[PDB]
Design a protein around this ligand. Sequence first.
Ligand code: UDP
Ligand code: NAG
Ligand code: MG
Length: 310
Amino acid sequence: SSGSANFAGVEYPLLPLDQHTPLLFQWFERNPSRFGENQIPIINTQQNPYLNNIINAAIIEKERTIGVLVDGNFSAGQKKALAKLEKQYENIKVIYNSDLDYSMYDKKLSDIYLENIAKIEAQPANVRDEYLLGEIKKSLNEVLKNNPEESLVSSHDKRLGHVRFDFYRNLFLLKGSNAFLEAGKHGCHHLQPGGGCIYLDADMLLTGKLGTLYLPDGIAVHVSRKGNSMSLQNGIIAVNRSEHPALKKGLEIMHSKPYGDPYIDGVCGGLRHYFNCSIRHNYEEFCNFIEFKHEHIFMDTSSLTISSWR
Ligand SMILES: O=c1ccn([C@@H]2O[C@H](COP(=O)(O)OP(=O)(O)O)[C@@H](O)[C@H]2O)c(=O)[nH]1
Ligand SMILES: CC(=O)N[C@@H]1[C@@H](O)[C@H](O)[C@@H](CO)O[C@H]1O
Ligand SMILES: [Mg+2]
């Protein structure tokens, strides 16, 4: 521990994330056919040189495990290319999302709907959200018509866009360093069970070594300052431990809300609940408090060109 930062009447120690804390990048590919059969299936265009950025981060942080969480229907040659990348850079560990078991974070959709119907019925009739009650009842009806066993994981798994890799990003960060050991990644000499993790968007250009970070209660996230507004953002998520209470609270919210969003609820909601940033608090002050800052990271370079999913 170093100093401390105040927010909403609570004093938070700036907890350390040592230099052995692993870095984490993520590539979930919807269209693996846009790469060669023996190509590394991670985008690497002039506008989005993301494979190059990852390799540059692995070269700069030579004494740090660099995890690449990948997903998509990859061809055999593409997987062999990923293994070749793992061999060309010792610290790069490729983790296939399908090799991780996320069932311990799952919940039945019908259970969420039933609990919400009970909790709307348990409140005085003059304040019940009746429109929401109706929408939850239609959602449950459709679940019973199409797949009664539908769950958070399975429903998000069927998504084809950013929501899916947001969801799995949060779950992986809950696993923390433990995900590396669960996937059988050998030679991760520095990883401790229960260790943390620093997730970075691939467009977060490292220009130097990160050293040791000091974050309030051991967590910080990106703050986008595009144009005249600012917003909490999951483009960077640094935690000093597995099962971090802020991300665990985001998962709690998603277990309780009928239509929880991995970003709005799993990240922003969890942070604001954990740190007591209500709608009556200053959102800008909280952004300044929780912001992940670093002089050796050129942040969100995808805004100089085009977004890879937009
Ligand atoms: O097909 C895609 C597009 C994006 N991403 C992930 O989304 C992140 C954000 O990419 P980018 O910075 O281009 O988007 P932005 O959110 O800045 O618009 C990337 O780093 C990847 O982890 C992905 O996995 N697959
Ligand atoms: C301005 C914008 O698009 N922000 C998106 C956010 O909505 C999304 O939840 C997140 C994860 O995909 O990526 C950000 O870049
Ligand atoms: Mg970006």
